[PDB]
Amino acid sequence: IVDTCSLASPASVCRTKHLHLRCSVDFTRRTLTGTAALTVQSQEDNLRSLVLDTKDLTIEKVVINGQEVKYALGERQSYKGSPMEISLPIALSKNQEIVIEISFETSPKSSALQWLTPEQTSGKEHPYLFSQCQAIHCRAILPCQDTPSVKLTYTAEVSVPKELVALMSAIRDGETPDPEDPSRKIYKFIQKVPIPCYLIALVVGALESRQIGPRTLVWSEKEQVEKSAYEFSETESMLKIAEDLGGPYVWGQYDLLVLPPSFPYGGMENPCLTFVTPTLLAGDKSLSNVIAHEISHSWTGNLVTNKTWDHFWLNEGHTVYLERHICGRLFGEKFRHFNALGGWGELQNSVKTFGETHPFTKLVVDLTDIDPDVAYSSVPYEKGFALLFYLEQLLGGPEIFLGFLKAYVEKFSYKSITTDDWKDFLYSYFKDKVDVLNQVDWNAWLYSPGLPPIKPNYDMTLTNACIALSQRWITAKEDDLNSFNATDLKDLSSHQLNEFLAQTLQRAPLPLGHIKRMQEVYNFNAINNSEIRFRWLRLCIQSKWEDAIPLALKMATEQGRMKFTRPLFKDLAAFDKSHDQAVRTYQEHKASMHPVTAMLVGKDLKVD
Ligand SMILES: O=C(CCC(=O)N1CCC[C@H]1C(=O)O)[C@@H]1CCCN1
Numbered sequence: 001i002v003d004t005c006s007l008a009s010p011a012s013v014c015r016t017k018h019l020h021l022r023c024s025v026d027f028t029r030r031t032l033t034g035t036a037a038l039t040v041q042s043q044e045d046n047l048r049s050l051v052l053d054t055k056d057l058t059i060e061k062v063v064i065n066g067q068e069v070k071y072a073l074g075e076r077q078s079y080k081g082s083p084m085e086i087s088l089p090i091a092l093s094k095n096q097e098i099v100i101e102i103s104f105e106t107s108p109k110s111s112a113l114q115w116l117t118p119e120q121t122s123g124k125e126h127p128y129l130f131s132q133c134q135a136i137h138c139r140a141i142l143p144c145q146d147t148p149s150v151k152l153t154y155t156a157e158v159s160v161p162k163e164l165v166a167l168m169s170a171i172r173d174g175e176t177p178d179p180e181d182p183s184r185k186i187y188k189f190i191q192k193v194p195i196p197c198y199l200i201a202l203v204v205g206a207l208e209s210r211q212i213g214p215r216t217l218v219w220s221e222k223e224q225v226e227k228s229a230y231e232f233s234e235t236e237s238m239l240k241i242a243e244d245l246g247g248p249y250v251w252g253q254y255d256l257l258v259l260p261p262s263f264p265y266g267g268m269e270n271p272c273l274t275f276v277t278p279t280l281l282a283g284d285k286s287l288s289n290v291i292a293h294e295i296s297h298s299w300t301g302n303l304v305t306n307k308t309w310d311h312f313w314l315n316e317g318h319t320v321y322l323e324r325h326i327c328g329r330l331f332g333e334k335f336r337h338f339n340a341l342g343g344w345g346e347l348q349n350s351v352k353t354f355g356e357t358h359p360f361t362k363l364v365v366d367l368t369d370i371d372p373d374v375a376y377s378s379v380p381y382e383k384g385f386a387l388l389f390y391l392e393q394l395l396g397g398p399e400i401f402l403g404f405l406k407a408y409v410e411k412f413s414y415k416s417i418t419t420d421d422w423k424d425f426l427y428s429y430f431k432d433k434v435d436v437l438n439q440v441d442w443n444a445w446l447y448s449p450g451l452p453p454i455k456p457n458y459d460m461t462l463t464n465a466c467i468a469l470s471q472r473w474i475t476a477k478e479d480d481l482n483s484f485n486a487t488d489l490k491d492l493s494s495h496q497l498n499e500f501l502a503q504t505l506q507r508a509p510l511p512l513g514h515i516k517r518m519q520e521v522y523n524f525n526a527i528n529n530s531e532i533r534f535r536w537l538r539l540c541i542q543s544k545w546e547d548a549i550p551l552a553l554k555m556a557t558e559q560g561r562m563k564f565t566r567p568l569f570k571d572l573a574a575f576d577k578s579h580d581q582a583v584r585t586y587q588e589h590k591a592s593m594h595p596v597t598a599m600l601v602g603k604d605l606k607v608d
């Protein structure tokens, strides 16, 4: 009903139908300058003004019908920014449209953007810029109705130093020299499918591309292209599976962009151009579920969208459910269950971390006065997933539940919805299984904090060997350590190795002699897989091994994926031997970190 994260006019007052963006990237000033032309349709009679979201934007003027109009910026409301009211020259009737042209400039401190100097890049000779608009940072790039309840099409023309390449969440529509300036190029983009504004994305850097499938290029700096092509080579097979599960892929191209290491997420589902962390580059495709997840959002999230951020689980739960079905089609149902049981484990971790009563462990959250970056967690992912896996099992199994998902996607394509919309459609589709549905504790699942009231059933086949080795280490006494050997690992996949470490980490600390023996026989220090290394380093630091302190600081600072960086810094702050170092290292690095990450690691460490 009400988007408590947006200050703009709601969609019941007016709706943006289209954005035509013309902007210029200035690396010297770290500003984006340009014009945002919004086509806005009135939803009411006699509309004479409207309000847009902005954060730290400089507004030059607003033009309608070729004349400047009056506008007013209200006072800042912390993380929400400042509302911008515009006085329309003529009153609009219901469904009438006008085009509002706003000239603006971003702040170098924009919460949407990270600006990188040449030394922070792979090639060391060119700077780099990237955006991350989800959840509410589009307002820090351009003035807009910064709410997923509104969906618009967009066209953009971006001017950049001619040695650099611009990409956006859109189909590429040519490059030309900038006729106003020969040192620059203009890149053009078209997004013909309506999208919420959190899906607007921009990258500018010394990018190259390699084709990896019929509708997929990978893009990165030259140094990463080869490894990326290999690592994501499953993309087209996964797109095909996802089409079978969700119906047609409506976006045209499915390209991948591998960001610098400071990117805060594993991935970001920007339409036409999924953004991924280079920490995926394990060498063996083992972290490809991230891609399966990003691909899945082309249906769940990007086609059917949460109406407000309070209903984020809709986007994420369903996406995790489809992701695990793609991985299950490729590798088997026993693997699907393995990954699902892992997921429950992750849910346990988040709920223990927040506390059983914390409101951020509820599936549907109330984000009134809560910065969504602060609330962000695995909970909507994994409690959302568990709810759907529970429902699958209750309602007749995966094939049956997959027909509901495809139907849900068809019903709500191109729209924005609430948890109640979803639940009503669930009841409608499963009208002949209402008796079953009423056995569900909805208030607990949707609205109560803590672990779900009921645990799904999981096949244990692939997990048993992980638990068994974990238990042998946990229950080992000193006189048992000689019995461990490298051959312990011979029949474990890399996913199984990660799960053995996750199991053991849940029981951490182990004795220091146990962790040393583990290094001696398994040589976990040599593993470069990011997930495995992250869990190993946490196990080491929680077990108080001083030798791991430099390896942990290094991992925490050399990449910036929040999943890895936030807990490493937290573990390092909690180890007395590393506390001062963790703080100092944060303080030394904070100015060159991603602005969201920096804010969050500062809160975690209770510094500034
Ligand atoms: O759903 C995703 C990607 C998932 C993602 O990056 N995750 C899941 C929890 C931690 C993080 C990660 O794997 O680094 C994006 C994040 C904001 C909107 N959608």
Ligand SMILES: [Yb+3]
Pocket: none
């Ligand atoms: Yb009104």
Ligand SMILES: [Yb+3]
Pocket: 045, 046, 093
């Ligand atoms: Yb009227």
Ligand SMILES: [Yb+3]
Pocket: 061, 068
């Ligand atoms: Yb003027």
Ligand SMILES: [Yb+3]
Pocket: 424, 427, 428
């Ligand atoms: Yb109903």
Ligand SMILES: [Yb+3]
Pocket: 477, 479, 480
């Ligand atoms: Yb013994």
Ligand SMILES: [Zn+2]
Pocket: 293, 297, 315, 316, 319
């Ligand atoms: Zn997601």
